[PDB]
């Protein structure tokens, strides 16, 4: 309407609404990451709790670590779960025909960020989404250097399809969406937003001007829209709507 009291009431209401919904999308991304981190941490602990004898020959790694990788992979429906060693080999449990985990020598692991970055932090390392060479799907990898008595055993990796996060975000309420660390569109409730030719600059420009969680106005085709974005790890989560709620 027109009376400023009424317009202010509508603006304050929709701000709260849209903020709530943005937070649900933020929570979705957070919970996905923390579930995968907890899992990875539990797997690290089970591997490190084996005696050294079970860890210090490749055959013993196959027979003693392999089943653990397999059970864990199944438990969460991961794509791959694996352990990379300093000799460049990887003990790999992959989705497939029920064949046991095997040692693979062709994964060029000392060139891979999941391997090299795990050795530079004491935390879990989380990759951007990338194309997994084993099963040829886009994954987010959680990796962790495993130590026993201070001694490196190898680098654990857990590959989760990136589509799993995309699908979780898409199911959320609200016209919410998520950009990756390069500010490309990554997930959206409205699948049309994923058209790579769409211009997101008005929303990204408005976020740059306003900051995390700060509700803003912008224009599309000379009509007014409202929205907000916030950082969530290296992602940017946004929500937008028509301003007709406050103007009409």
Q: Under the rule (CB under 5 A), what is the footprint of Cl ion? A: 33
Shorter beta-carbon distance to Cl ion: residue 33 or 89:
33
Give the Å distances, CA to CA, from 191 to 22, 73, 176: 17, 30, 11
Shorter beta-carbon distance to Cl ion: residue 126 or 145:
126
CB of 70 to Cl ion, least distance (A): 23
Question: Alpha carbon 123 to chain centroid distance?
Answer: 16
CB of 134 to Cl ion, least distance (A): 19
Shorter beta-carbon distance to Cl ion: residue 33 or 73:
33
Shorter beta-carbon distance to Cl ion: residue 65 or 165:
165
CB of 140 to Cl ion, least distance (A): 5
Shorter beta-carbon distance to Cl ion: residue 6 or 75:
75
CB of 177 to Cl ion, least distance (A): 16
Q: Which of 125, 165, 128, 106 is CA-nearest to residue 44?
A: 125
CB of 132 to Cl ion, least distance (A): 15
């Amino acid at each position: 309407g027109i009376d400023p009291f009424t317009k202010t009431s509508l603006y304050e209401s929709t701000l709260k609404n849209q903020t709530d919904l943005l937070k649900v999308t933020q929570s979705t991304v957070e919970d996905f990451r923390s579930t995968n981190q907890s899992f990875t941490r539990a797997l690290e602990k089970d591997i490190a709790n084996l005696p050294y004898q079970s860890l210090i020959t490749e055959e013993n790694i196959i027979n003693n670590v392999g089943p653990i990788l397999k059970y864990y992979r199944h438990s969460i429906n991961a794509l791959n779960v694996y352990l990379g060693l300093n000799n460049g080999k990887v003990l790999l449990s992959q989705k497939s025909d029920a064949k046991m985990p095997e040692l693979r020598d062709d994964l060029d692991i000392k060139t891979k960020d999941w391997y090299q970055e795990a050795l530079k932090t004491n935390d879990i390392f989380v990759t951007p989404a990338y194309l997994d060479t084993v099963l040829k799907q886009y994954v987010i990898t959680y990796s962790k250097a495993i130590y026993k008595d201070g001694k490196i055993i190898g680098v654990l990796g857990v590959d989760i399809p990136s589509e799993d996060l995309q699908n979780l975000v898409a199911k959320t309420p609200g016209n919410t969406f998520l950009f990756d660390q390069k500010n490309k569109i990554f997930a959206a409730t409205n699948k049309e937003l994923l058209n790579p030719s769409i211009d997101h600059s008005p929303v990204l420009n408005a976020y740059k001007l306003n900051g995390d969680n700060n509700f803003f106005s912008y224009k599309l085709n000379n009509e007014e829209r409202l929205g907000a974005c916030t950082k969530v790890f290296a992602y940017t989560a946004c929500i937008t709507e028509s301003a007709d709620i406050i103007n009409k």
